[PDB]
Amino acid sequence: TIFEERHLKYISQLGKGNFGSVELCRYDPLGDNTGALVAVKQLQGPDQQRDFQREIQILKALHSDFIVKYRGVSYLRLVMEYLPSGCLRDFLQRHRARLDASRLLLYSSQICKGMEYLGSRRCVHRDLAARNILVESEAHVKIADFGLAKLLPLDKDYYVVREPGQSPIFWYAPESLSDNIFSRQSDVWSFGVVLYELFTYCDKSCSPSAEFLRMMVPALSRLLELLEEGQRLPAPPACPAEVHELMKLCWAPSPQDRPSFSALGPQLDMLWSG
Numbered sequence: 001t002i003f004e005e006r007h008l009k010y011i012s013q014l015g016k017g018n019f020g021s022v023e024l025c026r027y028d029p030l031g032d033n034t035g036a037l038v039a040v041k042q043l044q045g046p047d048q049q050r051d052f053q054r055e056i057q058i059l060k061a062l063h064s065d066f067i068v069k070y071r072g073v074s075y076l077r078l079v080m081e082y083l084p085s086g087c088l089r090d091f092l093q094r095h096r097a098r099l100d101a102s103r104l105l106l107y108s109s110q111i112c113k114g115m116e117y118l119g120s121r122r123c124v125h126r127d128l129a130a131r132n133i134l135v136e137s138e139a140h141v142k143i144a145d146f147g148l149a150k151l152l153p154l155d156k157d158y159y160v161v162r163e164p165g166q167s168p169i170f171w172y173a174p175e176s177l178s179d180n181i182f183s184r185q186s187d188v189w190s191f192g193v194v195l196y197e198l199f200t201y202c203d204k205s206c207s208p209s210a211e212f213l214r215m216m217v218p219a220l221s222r223l224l225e226l227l228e229e230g231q232r233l234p235a236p237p238a239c240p241a242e243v244h245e246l247m248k249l250c251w252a253p254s255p256q257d258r259p260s261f262s263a264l265g266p267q268l269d270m271l272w273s274g
């Protein structure tokens with residue numbers, strides 16, 4: 001669980017995003033190109049470093065088949081398993097022809113259990129989106145990107161963030177947009193949007209962005225008015241009705257009226273079997 005920097009050998013960039021990068025490296029103590037591939041996160045500020053230390057301790061404490069696996073650290077860097085299939089967003093866009101409704105329901109279920117495990121750990125993810133879900137195998141996904149994750153204090157069930165969110169606005173719960181309030185129930189909001197991503201196969205032309213522009217002053221405020229009015233994303237083409245109903249349930253105006261991940265899971269399992 002401790003990796004010497006000199007044995008970690010740079011290959012390429014996997015991702016870039018707010019103050020950090022993920023790289024493909026080979027952990028290669030023999031120096032001969034035979035070592036295992038790992039994904040390595042690092043920062044590129046005094047506070048981001050503190051947040052980074054917290055992100056590591058959170059992921060180190062997580063153990064689930066549906067959460068990207070922590071491998072160790074190097075001292076400054078976070079070492080993780082490397083999933084060559086990349087993110088679900090690109091996987092969906094590429095393998096559209098092979099993934100039927102069941103597969104999509106299998107993914108949904110797997111993400112759901114993962115989120116149920118996070119909630120049980122008192123962890124709010126804050127950035128659930130298909131781009132942050134990694135693909136382990138054609139029938140297995142894992143939640144990643146804990147850079148924004150917060151631990152809820154025992155006394156509270158919500159968290160308030162001082163500075164504005166830097167992710168696409170179309171994934172945020174209304175109370176996050178208006179008051180910077182994040183909770184396990186704002187995660188359920190974002191999960192509804194992830195479901196929408198799965199059943200559109202993250203098609204760009206019917207993405208949240210594209211759909212918002214079609215429904216029509218600051219964009220953040222417009223989106224708020226639309227959601228306040230009860231406007232919502234439409235059923236993805238060929239989307240099963242029961243699955244769309246689940247989205248709308250995740251998109252309940254008030255966080256208390258959104259179902260828990262533990263309630264959702266059973267329902268997704270039944271639809272998967274249905």
Ligand SMILES: C[C@@H](NC(=O)c1c[nH]c2ncc(C3CC3)nc12)C(=O)N1CCCCC1
Nearest residue numbers: 014015016017021022039081082083086087
């Ligand atoms: C989502 C996050 N990825 C990870 O933490 C990964 C862990 N093992 C992986 N195997 C393959 C990949 C492919 C997708 C690039 N990613 C990962 C990431 O890339 N980013 C972008 C940079 C900032 C953090 C979020």
